[PDB]
Amino acid sequence: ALWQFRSMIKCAIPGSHPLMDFNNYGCYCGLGGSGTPVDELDRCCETHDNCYRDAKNLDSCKFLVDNPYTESYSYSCSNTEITCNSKNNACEAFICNCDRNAAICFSKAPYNKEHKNLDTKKYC
Amino acid sequence: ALWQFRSMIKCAIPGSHPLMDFNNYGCYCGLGGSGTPVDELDRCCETHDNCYRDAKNLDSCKFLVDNPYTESYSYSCSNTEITCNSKNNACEAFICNCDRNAAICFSKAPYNKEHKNLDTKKYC
């Protein structure tokens, strides 16, 4: 679920403010996501978007009709280390893994302030 | 902007986990919406959607080309009371007030956990 992805970005990145840092960043961090992504971080978001599309295409997810941000899963954190619980069934695991992958990706990519809050209509 | 909406909810409702709580509830608290609001809290969200639509069409927001969640405003929290800074320019002030109205409305309306995570294609 989105609140869990938020939890994961705090887990992977200590004092982060996830919605204030990553939403409406570049061309892909946020909703929508169109164009050429503007940096590694943006590419994290674009990969995340492709992951959720693949979720919706996944046979294991056939009974999720809403979008994967509404699918709760099981996860834990340990010293900045995110854990997708083995207890997860197929769809929950896959969506858990999308969020984890993007959580780590955010932590390793450089944050470019100047890419925050672009004019997507012009540049994406 | 969306993080400030979250922070306003935290303000009005000190016990709050706003995404966990108010995202993906009913037919309107989430990705847009449609259908008949399922309860008062859900009507809080329809109203906020409408207010955002109004902002999108308000002359003073004519240079706001992205969604109103991307608009930064100045607000303050103090004693459960939300204040949209009187310094805000007109668009900023309008959207801040949409948000403030919504948190307040969320703080007044019953929360009905059987209304969370609805199958919106089926019930909205």
Ligand SMILES: CCCCCCCCCCCCCCCCCCOC[C@@H](O)COP(=O)(O)OCC[N+](C)(C)C
């Ligand atoms: C902080 C806790 C509060 C809970 C809020 C959490 C939800 C925030 C979500 C953040 C991510 C952004 C999601 C917002 C999406 C809502 C967006 C919902 O807006 C719906 C309309 O804008 C869509 O209409 P169209 O763009 O198709 O209109 C077409 C117009 N012509 C040109 C074709 C005629």
Ligand SMILES: [Ca+2]
């Ligand atoms: Ca996106």
Ligand SMILES: [Ca+2]
């Ligand atoms: Ca909505």
Ligand code: NA
């Ligand atoms: Na935001």
